[PDB]
Amino acid sequence: GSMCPKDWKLFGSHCYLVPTVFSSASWNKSEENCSRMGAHLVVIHSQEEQDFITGILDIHAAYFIGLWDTGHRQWQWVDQTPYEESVTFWHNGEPSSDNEKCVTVYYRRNIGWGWNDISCNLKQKSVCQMKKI
Amino acid sequence: SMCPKDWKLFGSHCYLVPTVFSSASWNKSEENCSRMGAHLVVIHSQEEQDFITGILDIHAAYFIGLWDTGHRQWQWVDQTPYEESVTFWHNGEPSSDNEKCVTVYYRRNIGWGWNDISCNLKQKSVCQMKKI
Numbered sequence: 327g328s329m330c331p332k333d334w335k336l337f338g339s340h341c342y343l344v345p346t347v348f349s350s351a352s353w354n355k356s357e358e359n360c361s362r363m364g365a366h367l368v369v370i371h372s373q374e375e376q377d378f379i380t381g382i383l384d385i386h387a388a389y390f391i392g393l394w395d396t397g398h399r400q401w402q403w404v405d406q407t408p409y410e411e412s413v414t415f416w417h418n419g420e421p422s423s424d425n426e427k428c429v430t431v432y433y434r435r436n437i438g439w440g441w442n443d444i445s446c447n448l449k450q451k452s453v454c455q456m457k458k459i
Numbered sequence: 460s461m462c463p464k465d466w467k468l469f470g471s472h473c474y475l476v477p478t479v480f481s482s483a484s485w486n487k488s489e490e491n492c493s494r495m496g497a498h499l500v501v502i503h504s505q506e507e508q509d510f511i512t513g514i515l516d517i518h519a520a521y522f523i524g525l526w527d528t529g530h531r532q533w534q535w536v537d538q539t540p541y542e543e544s545v546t547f548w549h550n551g552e553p554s555s556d557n558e559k560c561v562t563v564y565y566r567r568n569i570g571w572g573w574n575d576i577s578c579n580l581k582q583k584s585v586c587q588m589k590k591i
């Protein structure tokens with residue numbers, strides 16, 4: 327049958343969903359909602375994944391991704407796969423603050439999509455991924 | 460056939476050195492295997508180590524499905540248990556806390572063994588899947 331659950335979007339080996347009804351939540355609560363679906367906050371390893379994920383988002387909203395600071399700019403993916411500084415999509419001037427331990431993706435007008443470090447406790451939208459069948 | 464076209468049978472698994480896909484990072488290599496319904500090789504025996512290395516070029520290094528999730532906390536990409544007593548590290552390996560991804564390569568007059576290297580370095584790779 328289908329490689330993805332109903333209403334999930336296929337790209338590469340993964341299935342993606344923006345949980346629309348789940349209202350804005352903290353990074354921990356967003357990861358927990360992904361987890362309830364057998365998924366994780368998105369783990370963005372490539373330009374192709376950054377482009378696909380941002381293609382299914384609303385340019386007017388900011389979305390938590392599965393990247394967090396375990397120390398002092400020691401970025402870790404929620405699935406613990408390697409973080410590669412050379413393949414990142416930080417907005418200009420980001421990351422900005424050792425007090426901002428979670429990461430969102432949002433659209434800057436006349437620039438495009440990029441990552442921003444933010445307070446883990448701020449409520450944001452999110453995007454989930456899982457392996458396909 | 461137990462295995463897809465161009466894949467090689469050993470035990471309950473099919474193995475492939477990807478060709479259309481040139482040298483790549485550990486993450487890109489793992490995604491390339493996953494797109495084929497496969498994963499980077501997970502090595503649970505001497506026989507698997509020998510079969511996998513048997514189908515490689517002694518002049519190249521190949522990513523395997525082993526990486527450090529923290530501080531010498533080695534994990535297989537299929538979540539099967541890491542057993543330090545059934546490993547094939549080269550002498551002096553794993554060498555460095557900043558080398559988080561594992562390659563298998565040939566040392567002249569020694570043979571094949573594992574080396575921790577930087578995850579960002581481009582290497583060849585080997586994929587594994589269950590047979591049909």
Ligand SMILES: O=P([O-])([O-])O[C@@H]1[C@H](O[C@H]2O[C@H](CO)[C@@H](O)[C@H](O)[C@@H]2O)[C@H](O)[C@@H](O)[C@H](O)[C@H]1O[C@H]1O[C@H](CO)[C@@H](O)[C@H](O)[C@@H]1O
Pocket residue numbers: 420422425426442443444445
């Ligand atoms: O504009 P707000 O109030 O949302 O946030 C303030 C600005 O930072 C934001 O924008 C920059 C990009 O210009 C990002 O790097 C940053 O992550 C924020 O999204 C100001 O530029 C910044 O100097 C200021 O500190 C920041 O305040 C917010 O963040 C603080 C730390 O999380 C909170 O204590 C504060 O209440 C507020 O939420």
Ligand SMILES: O=P([O-])([O-])O[C@H]1[C@H](O)[C@@H](O)[C@H](O)[C@@H](O)[C@H]1O[C@H]1O[C@H](CO)[C@@H](O)[C@H](O)[C@@H]1O
Pocket residue numbers: 552554558574575576
């Ligand atoms: O430039 P290289 O020789 O290919 O790699 C070196 C590496 O950058 C440096 O940090 C090491 O001190 C040096 O020995 C080289 O390391 C390679 O070889 C050792 C084994 O001899 C491996 O353990 C390393 O993972 C590198 O492959």
Ligand SMILES: [Ca+2]
Pocket residue numbers: 420421422423426442443444
């Ligand atoms: Ca910031």
Ligand SMILES: [Ca+2]
Pocket residue numbers: 552553554555558574575576
């Ligand atoms: Ca090494």
